[PDB]
Symmetry: none
Subunit: 284 residues, 2 copies
């Protein structure tokens, strides 16, 4: 019953998505926060293809698919190299120096989409897109092992229409390792002490209180909210096969079109749902 | 061919292990190329007809394992075990997510009272689809799924038979373009890939095999059985699917030819040999 909320300028409206195929080198060579199980690269490819099929085939977005680069094992995680807000694209300077060559082809793709490009070139600045939470009315930027204060300052200078606040992020995480937007004014949030401390800080800094959807698995707090024509609220979330008790929480969004999306292989290299796309609203 | 019936003939089987396909196969099974949408209900009907050939028509005792929705490729039981005489090699599939399929196959082959050997070496991979047993020796394709260590463990397991390796290209298995069509008879595709592999196989062997060349590589995958009171039996792809290849099989005048549809499972590279493990219990 959310279909009445379809609007060309609604929060979460997108027309285009940029994604990038994963290389075979991802299985052995992609960075990961913990030693774990062997990545099944063929299964990861199939899951990525299904994720792309949701964005393009099921939801109707125009998907730009960048080719894999075997020398960039993390290149599937396009979120980290660009932040798009309205008509402006910030090309980031990733915290991991070997990922910085990923920005070149993202830049070309976003230039083709007629976006206004700003490049993070300050040699003292790092920022991963995964540390950036855009709520629809402000930005929160995680200060992490990958994103620093200067990177957040450049983001604030680039997106002059929005307030920007920083939040400290622990250990080897990104801000969106445990949160994301699940709808207008609605933050999905994990249950760990790290996640709860972070939400407390963002709530205290903001002009207004966000609603929250608390899930028991931090990783399952990473979802993709979209507002799609003739549907309204749409949410991609981790499957009940992967995280049954978090999927049950999302089931309460009775006016959302809920789409379960498997990501069990890329999870092994810290790849969550938001990581694998950059969303753009090209207003016609 | 009926006079060729013998409990020790090449291709004699008494039992088959198969596994039902899960609903998740349609969207989640691995596949070599993007293609058409899988019709899962039609795939299931086709699998049921295949099982009916092995059990009802040909009289094998069929062990039917249940589908696991978490293992979308689990219907393809060939890849997880190779059986030779009274010995079963439980393989270590090339795709790591498929390795949990071995558990229930291992269980089934123990109830059949076979000698079980498990490929556990963390450096070894082997898909049963890469293994051609000719009745005289093994050929093992070195592919994106099967490596040298896997073939060595196969050779150490089946000590009564010579084992030789053959390079396999792309996203293929050795039996993506060949299979046994009868005693000393290899069905082989017409492509340059298939012909080069057959040439290598013939150079390494003590003796020359007879061949049956089919114009469609995929239709060179067939199942040969020696069945009591029948002799030569062959399951092959239908004339509706591969008319030019079915014509070639129609030349086997002393084989009982059984056309078997596999049009849906072919979309995820599932051919005839993939869907069963055959066993001869004396």
């Amino acid at each position: 019953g959310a279909a009445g909320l379809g609007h060309p300028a609604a929060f979460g409206r997108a027309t285009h998505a940029v994604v990038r195929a994963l290389p075979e080198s991802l299985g052995q060579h992609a960075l990961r926060s913990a030693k774990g199980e062997e990545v099944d690269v063929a299964r990861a490819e199939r899951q990525h293809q299904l994720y792309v099929g949701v964005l393009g085939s099921k939801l109707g977005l125009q998907v730009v698919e960048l080719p894999a680069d075997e020398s960039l094992p993390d290149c599937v995680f396009v979120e980290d190299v660009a932040v798009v807000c309205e008509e402006t694209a910030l090309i980031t300077r990733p915290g991991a120096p070997s990922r910085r060559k990923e920005v070149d082809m993202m830049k070309e793709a976003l230039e083709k989409l007629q976006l206004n490009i700003v490049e993070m070139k300050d040699e003292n600045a790092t920022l991963d897109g995964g540390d950036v939470l855009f709520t629809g009315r402000e930005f929160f930027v995680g200060l992490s092992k990958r994103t620093n204060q200067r990177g957040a300052e450049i983001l604030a200078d680039t997106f002059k229409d929005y307030a920007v606040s920083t939040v400290p992020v622990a250990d080897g995480l990104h801000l969106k390792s445990f949160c994301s937007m699940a709808g207008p004014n609605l933050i999905a949030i994990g249950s760990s002490e790290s996640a709860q401390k972070a939400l407390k800080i963002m709530q205290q800094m903001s002009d207004h209180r966000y609603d929250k959807l608390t899930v028991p698995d931090d990783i399952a707090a990473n979802c993709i909210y979209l507002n799609i024509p003739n549907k309204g609220h749409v949410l991609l979330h981790r499957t009940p096969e992967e995280y049954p008790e978090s999927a049950k929480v999302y089931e309460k969004l009775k006016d959302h079109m809920l789409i379960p999306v498997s990501m069990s292989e890329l999870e092994k290299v810290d790849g969550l749902l938001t990581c694998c796309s950059v969303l753009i609203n090209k207003k016609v």
